[PDB]
Design a protein around this ligand. Structure first.
Ligand code: HEM
Ligand code: HEM
Lengths: 453, 453
């Protein structure tokens, strides 16, 4: 019974129930619980996910010590989340020196050099997206953005990770699209209250990643890794490092994590962005004019062109402030240490509430408002990089940050070049967030899509 | 399923059954299984305790790298054996830097200086032992040595660990003697086949150490730690270091481990020694003459006197060669490494079969024989310290080695000064070892005890 740890350390927080801890407070949701605790407890507080002690920190210097300074020494890993199977070799799931071998093996794939090589392949589906949009624009019926963006996010993934070129919106039957289309609480709740059952689920071959999908994928790599190019994508870039090096099953696990990390992240954020532009027409028009100025006469976007649109980058950053889809950052304290004046005992999970810090008035003026001008080159300097942490920070931040930014902007440039977006009767205004544990709209975003000539 | 690990590494061993591994081979016993594998497989082999891979090594240089050279870096911990409770803080059970804090905190207690201070207290019960022996010597009926030695081993423990002076043979009702009097397979078998159930047993407060005993002890320390000497033993020596330092519950756990490590180890070996001397009268008389020469006219043994009897030390060492009560040494490989030419992957338990190496003809002539002359100052030089490992080796060897040697010899000097030991009709000749997992006689040792005048 570790429930006295925080009152023994003199750390405030909600009183834990036996076995359950504080998990019943998640009824309002992950983020609201972080916001309430931040308001009534202060800069540091603790709570129990079952019997697991979780210390929340909000001091920008302390966050830097955890995420950057003492990353390799103490705060190296995340906490386990369930029976993982062979996916223990995924970089996002690996720990300690095993992870350090993968982060080093996989860093050159996300170079700005390899990123520019992927733009033409993913720009091909920016045209595929706009084409699937012209039909629903003449259809005259509102559009569920998560379906078109999800198809686009899928079409970019398969081409960038395997070269497989599909119109997943128009080819919902390709065996490569069904499996890839495959959170919630009815399981992962019990995992946190019963983490002593994770070792049981492992020996039963029960995995959080379905056995239906993974078998198709390790064997669909089995054909296309060798027997296909045995005569620029994420797969080809990792193979070149095999020839301390990556294994076969290791390489499969890393590619599976890229699809998971790319599909319902790109499309979720892109759906959030279009909701903001439709409900803020001043911003959508101002962006459409910057898009038209840099790219005159519906010109195609390039690598260097995207990194030039400042208002586009300002719209992306501010949407990520309101909606950091990761919600929290977490590190497991590997040993007794003392960071910036307080003692963290071994085993305690240190947590940075990204969603709560993104909406704290201590740093944000009118936090509920969508105001891209906070990221103007005048005011971007006044933003603490350890308060605004949409991609994390330190040696274990989001490795696909620059890919995600480029992929999302290339979709927005093409989409806003040809269309305008307006709210409908079905448009949830104000948008309500999911009550679960996924930073998604409560009800899917539906907007009117008008064609620009 | 890690059952292919050793045939993937090209390492020989018995083929594992699903789930069970090689545990069914323990029917002949722990040591016989090690002896057979050593004979038919060679210097290195592997086997599975359920799903846990265990690599056995017999190369003296490789054993030094595991036990000494790469102890702190890689081979630091032992493997978990069951639900342990608060006894996770015991030095023998602690891991990594937590153990290093305890081994450093507890090393000064086992100084030769503190050891000489304990001789008068434990010599007091060497007289208590001889007194309980004179009655059974005039009784004329054979003596179960494990009862008298167990009582003596208990009377030394309570006085050296708490100052409690009891005649546990004559006071079997003292509340301090019953609890301390409290392996086998019907549980620890399933723990190795179901190690995924250890986390379950922990949350159920189910502990390998009974809740009946520990509560009496943490609270019997609660009175005598403070409320008794609040106005030389293992307890007083640890308290002086509290006043990074030892905690209250930590101090209780270390004292509990000393009783466990001292009771059925001292008395078990002492029972083995008296069996050897009774069935080898040439050695018993030669020792009784050395005991009489150094200590003329039944003189009391002292610290410096004990370290002077060479044949006594030779009898103790050779009995420990035939019966290393630990049977094996073990270390958990903390990370992928390469020791003396072969690759050990992370998680593999490295095992040194002490019992098998103590009876290997590659280093031992007539290994089944009791021949104390192997440890003569002429031939002691030809004994590899990494073959003969009764107390382990390296930074995590037996911390109470010099205490155990002094405590056993002080019993033998007094006992052989007053008595002689001869086999009976009940004396199991040849002595059969336990078929279980405890290096003990199959049937308890019973010998005729004659009084010397
Ligand atoms: C809008 C898009 C995305 C957002 C907001 C996002 C956010 C994040 C965050 C907050 C983390 C945790 C960082 C930390 O703990 O300090 C993370 C980790 C990670 N992300 Fe992303 N991500 C996005 C897209 C992607 C994409 C497209 C990929 C790959 C193609 C990717 C791959 C990863 C990986 C592998 C990790 C784990 C890194 C490690 O543990 O070494 N992410 N992401
Ligand atoms: C004939 C008597 C004894 C024998 C043969 C013996 C043997 C051993 C062996 C083989 C080990 C493992 C060493 C290794 O893994 O390298 C060990 C560990 C240990 N022994 Fe003993 N022992 C004896 C008596 C004692 C006594 C009397 C005490 C304390 C009063 C004691 C305390 C310990 C402790 C604490 C450890 C664990 C050390 C650590 O993990 O840091 N032993 N013993």
């Amino acid at each position: 019974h570790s429930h006295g740890l925080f009152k023994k350390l003199g750390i405030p927080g909600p009183t834990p129930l036996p076995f359950l801890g504080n998990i019943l407070s998640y009824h309002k949701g992950f983020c609201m619980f972080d916001m309430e605790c931040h308001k009534k407890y202060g800069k540091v507080w603790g709570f129990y996910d079952g019997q697991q002690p979780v210390l929340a920190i909000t001091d920008p210097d302390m966050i830097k010590t955890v995420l950057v300074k003492e990353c390799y020494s103490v705060f190296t890993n995340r906490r386990p989340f369930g029976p993982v199977g062979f996916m223990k070799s995924a970089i996002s799931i690996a720990e300690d020196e095993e992870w350090k071998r993968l982060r080093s093996l996989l860093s050159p794939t996300f170079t700005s050099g390899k990123l520019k090589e992927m733009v033409p392949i993913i720009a091909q589906y920016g045209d595929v997206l706009v084409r699937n949009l012209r039909r629903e624009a003449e259809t005259g019926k509102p559009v569920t953005l998560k379906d078109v963006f999800g198809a686009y996010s899928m079409d970019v993934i398969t081409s960038t990770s395997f070269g497989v070129n599909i119109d997943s919106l128009n080819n919902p039957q390709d065996p490569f699209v069904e499996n890839t289309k495959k959170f919630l609480d009815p399981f992962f709740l019990s995992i946190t209250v019963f983490p002593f059952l994770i070792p049981i689920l492992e020996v039963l071959n029960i995995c959080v990643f379905p056995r239906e999908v993974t078998n198709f994928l390790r064997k669909s790599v089995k054909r296309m890794k060798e027997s296909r190019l045995e005569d620029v994508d994420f797969l080809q870039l990792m193979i070149d490092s095999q020839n301390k090096a990556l294994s076969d099953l290791e390489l499969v696990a890393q590619s599976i994590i890229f699809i998971f990390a790319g599909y319902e992240t790109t499309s979720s954020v892109l759906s959030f962005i279009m909701y903001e532009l439709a409900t803020h027409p001043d911003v959508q028009q101002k962006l459409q004019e910057e898009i038209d100025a840099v790219l005159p006469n519906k010109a195609p976007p390039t690598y260097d062109t995207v990194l030039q649109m400042e208002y586009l980058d300002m719209v992306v950053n501010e949407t990520l402030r309101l909606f950091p889809i990761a919600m929290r950052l977490e590190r497991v304290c590997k040993k007794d240490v003392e960071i910036n004046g307080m003692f963290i005992p071994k085993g305690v999970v240190v947590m940075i509430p990204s969603y709560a810090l993104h909406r704290d008035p201590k740093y944000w003026t009118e936090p509920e408002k969508f105001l891209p001008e906070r990221f103007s080159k005048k005011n971007k300097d006044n933003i603490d990089p350890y308060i605004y942490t949409p991609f994390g920070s330190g040696p274990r931040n989001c490795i696909g940050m620059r890919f995600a930014l480029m992929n999302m902007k290339l979709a927005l440039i093409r989409v806003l070049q040809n269309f305008s977006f307006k709210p409908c009767k079905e448009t949830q205004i104000p948008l309500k967030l999911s009550l679960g544990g996924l930073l998604q709209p409560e009800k899917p975003v539906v907007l009117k899509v008008e064609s620009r000539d």
